[PDB]
Enzyme design. Structure first.
Site, PDB file in Angstrom:
ATOM      1  N   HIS A   1      84.219  44.065  99.208  1.00  0.00           N
ATOM      2  CA  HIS A   1      83.613  45.031 100.151  1.00  0.00           C
ATOM      3  C   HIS A   1      84.286  46.476 100.157  1.00  0.00           C
ATOM      4  CE1 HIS A   1      80.857  45.596 103.869  1.00  0.00           C
ATOM      5  NE2 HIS A   1      81.400  46.780 103.787  1.00  0.00           N
TER       6      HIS A   1
ATOM      7  N   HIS B   1      82.825  50.725  99.381  1.00  0.00           N
ATOM      8  CA  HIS B   1      81.669  51.535  99.033  1.00  0.00           C
ATOM      9  C   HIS B   1      82.115  52.636  98.073  1.00  0.00           C
ATOM     10  CE1 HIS B   1      79.137  50.345 102.712  1.00  0.00           C
ATOM     11  NE2 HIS B   1      80.278  49.768 103.103  1.00  0.00           N
TER      12      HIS B   1
ATOM     13  N   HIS C   1      75.339  44.015 105.789  1.00  0.00           N
ATOM     14  CA  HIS C   1      76.300  44.258 106.899  1.00  0.00           C
ATOM     15  C   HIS C   1      75.834  43.804 108.326  1.00  0.00           C
ATOM     16  CE1 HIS C   1      77.676  47.326 103.946  1.00  0.00           C
ATOM     17  NE2 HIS C   1      78.640  47.862 104.754  1.00  0.00           N
TER      18      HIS C   1
ATOM     19  N   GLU D   1      79.279  43.869 112.708  1.00  0.00           N
ATOM     20  CA  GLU D   1      80.508  44.745 112.713  1.00  0.00           C
ATOM     21  C   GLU D   1      80.611  45.502 114.058  1.00  0.00           C
ATOM     22  OE1 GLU D   1      80.170  48.136 110.124  1.00  0.00           O
ATOM     23  OE2 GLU D   1      82.041  49.020 110.396  1.00  0.00           O
TER      24      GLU D   1
ATOM     25  N   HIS E   1      81.696  42.178 107.338  1.00  0.00           N
ATOM     26  CA  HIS E   1      82.369  42.011 108.650  1.00  0.00           C
ATOM     27  C   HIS E   1      82.027  40.745 109.402  1.00  0.00           C
ATOM     28  CE1 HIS E   1      83.488  46.348 108.087  1.00  0.00           C
ATOM     29  NE2 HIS E   1      82.210  46.533 107.767  1.00  0.00           N
TER      30      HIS E   1
ATOM     31  N   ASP F   1      86.668  48.813 102.577  1.00  0.00           N
ATOM     32  CA  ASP F   1      85.434  49.538 103.012  1.00  0.00           C
ATOM     33  C   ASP F   1      85.272  50.958 102.402  1.00  0.00           C
ATOM     34  OD1 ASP F   1      83.906  49.435 106.424  1.00  0.00           O
ATOM     35  OD2 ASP F   1      83.170  49.458 104.317  1.00  0.00           O
TER      36      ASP F   1
HETATM   37  N1  LIG Z   1      81.210  52.350 106.167  1.00  0.00           N
HETATM   38  C1  LIG Z   1      79.911  52.499 105.962  1.00  0.00           C
HETATM   39  O1  LIG Z   1      79.116  52.114 106.839  1.00  0.00           O
HETATM   40  C2  LIG Z   1      79.461  53.210 104.764  1.00  0.00           C
HETATM   41  C3  LIG Z   1      78.190  53.426 104.439  1.00  0.00           C
HETATM   42  N2  LIG Z   1      78.244  54.097 103.161  1.00  0.00           N
HETATM   43  C4  LIG Z   1      77.100  54.722 102.465  1.00  0.00           C
HETATM   44  C5  LIG Z   1      76.365  53.671 101.583  1.00  0.00           C
HETATM   45  O2  LIG Z   1      77.527  53.108 100.888  1.00  0.00           O
HETATM   46  C6  LIG Z   1      76.090  55.451 103.347  1.00  0.00           C
HETATM   47  C7  LIG Z   1      76.786  56.482 104.286  1.00  0.00           C
HETATM   48  C8  LIG Z   1      75.813  57.373 105.047  1.00  0.00           C
HETATM   49  C9  LIG Z   1      76.321  58.297 105.941  1.00  0.00           C
HETATM   50  C10 LIG Z   1      75.487  59.142 106.661  1.00  0.00           C
HETATM   51  C11 LIG Z   1      74.095  59.021 106.531  1.00  0.00           C
HETATM   52  C12 LIG Z   1      73.539  58.079 105.648  1.00  0.00           C
HETATM   53  C13 LIG Z   1      74.440  57.290 104.903  1.00  0.00           C
HETATM   54  C14 LIG Z   1      79.509  54.204 102.810  1.00  0.00           C
HETATM   55  N3  LIG Z   1      80.291  53.710 103.699  1.00  0.00           N
HETATM   56 ZN   LIG Z   2      80.738  48.567 104.486  1.00  0.00          ZN
END
Ligand SMILES: NC(=O)c1cn([C@@H](CO)CCc2ccccc2)cn1
Ligand SMILES: [Zn+2]
Length: 349
Positions: free
Chosen positions: A12, A14, A211, A214, A235, A292
């Site tokens: 997990h 990104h 997800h 969380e 989560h 994360d």
């Molecule tokens: N921790 C998280 O929830 C998260 C989500 N992302 C990305 C997809 O990997 C999308 C982040 C995002 C932020 C603002 C608007 C739309 C998408 C990366 N980290």
């Molecule tokens: Zn995540």
């Protein structure tokens, strides 16, 4: 100093939250985008965080930085190569990285993200540039790497593109689909766009993670298990608020992708209460430990393990257990999975 100086596995993390400030700077600079700051170190503590935040404040971080890479071929392949390099220095032997390809695209994508103008980089091209960066990374750094593409809660009309992409690039390197973004949007698990993506996924043999729990209620987890037919949870912590669902999910040995430092930083976890991972440890649940968003959280994998060792009593034995549950709950072909398990059993004795 490392809390657990042995090979690990990470399920997990990104990609878009695991970029080098130095590369952001580079493309920013090179493209005329316009960062909050102009040396590596400053950017880092600007995008970084050390307290819980609003949601709006958290999301705004991706504005600072995303326009610098989205839309740029060079940089899309570069973040993916550079990611694998990063997981090398943490001692990982297998990692699944996830990201939404729409969100690095600037063409044939509506709305266009991050206020980009329209260029010519498509979501489907985005997936092969990350595949390239990841595969050339694997071969140089010695980490085995697969990816997972995310649908986004607020945008169910991308999701059939998602699954179609997973089936188009499958084991090269995509092995699963996820559902990421704001889990509190009412009904979002059941938007027909996302439902039918995950039914195509079952019908096409693509693995599924989501997800949930969380920061949503446990009913969100129950919708991911019973209706999206998920195989693992991102989560999953509010699963504890529904005893019978918790008990059933231990029963079928559901894997929880736990992310402890992220969970304190985001608010998800209140410092004055037992962390859900200790309950999991004590109940012997199937879970993994994961970073994360290393960029946002100014972390590396060892941060997560130092938290739980330090501030929670976790032992080496527990560490070994949890990585072995990770490998067992990965989305690799069964032959490959058992190869992984051999690598870890040997390293672990
Ligand atoms: N921790 C998280 O929830 C998260 C989500 N992302 C990305 C997809 O990997 C999308 C982040 C995002 C932020 C603002 C608007 C739309 C998408 C990366 N980290
Ligand atoms: Zn995540």
């Amino acid at each position: 100093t490392p809390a657990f100086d042995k090979p690990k596995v990470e399920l997990h993390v990104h990609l878009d939250g695991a970029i080098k400030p130095e590369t952001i700077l580079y493309y920013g600079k090179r493209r005329g985008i316009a960062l909050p700051a102009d040396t590596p170190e400053e950017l880092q503590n600007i995008i970084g965080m050390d307290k819980p935040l609003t949601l709006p404040d958290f999301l705004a971080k991706f504005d600072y930085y995303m326009p610098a890479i989205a839309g740029c071929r060079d940089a899309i392949k570069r973040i993916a190569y550079e990611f694998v390099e990063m997981k090398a220095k943490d001692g990982v032997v297998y990692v699944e990285v996830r990201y939404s390809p729409h969100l690095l695209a600037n063409s044939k994508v509506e709305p266009i993200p991050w206020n980009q103008a329209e260029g010519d980089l498509t979501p489907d091209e985005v997936v092969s540039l990350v595949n390239q960066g990841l595969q050339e990374g694997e071969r140089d750094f010695g980490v085995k790497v697969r990816s997972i593409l995310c649908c986004m809660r607020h945008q169910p009309s991308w999701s059939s593109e998602v699954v179609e992409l997973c089936k188009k690039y499958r084991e090269q390197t995509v092995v699963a689909i996820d559902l990421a973004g704001d889990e509190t949007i009412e009904g979002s698990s059941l938007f027909p766009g996302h439902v039918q993506a995950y039914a195509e996924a079952v019908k096409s043999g693509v693995h599924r993670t989501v997800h949930a729990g969380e920061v949503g209620s446990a009913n969100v987890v129950k919708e991911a298990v019973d209706t999206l037919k998920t195989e693992r949870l991102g989560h999953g912590y509010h699963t504890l608020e529904d005893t019978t669902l918790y008990n059933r999910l231990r029963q079928e040995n559901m894997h929880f992708e736990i992310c402890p430092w992220s969970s304190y930083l985001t608010g998800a976890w209140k410092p004055d209460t037992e962390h859900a991972v200790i309950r999991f440890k004590n109940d012997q649940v199937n879970y993994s430990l994961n970073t994360d968003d290393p960029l946002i959280f100014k972390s590396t994998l060892d941060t997560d393990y130092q938290m739980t060792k330090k501030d929670m009593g976790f032992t080496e034995e527990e560490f070994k257990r949890l990585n072995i549950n990770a490998a067992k709950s990965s989305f690799l072909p069964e032959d490959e999975k058992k190869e992984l398990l051999d690598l870890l059993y040997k390293a672990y004795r």
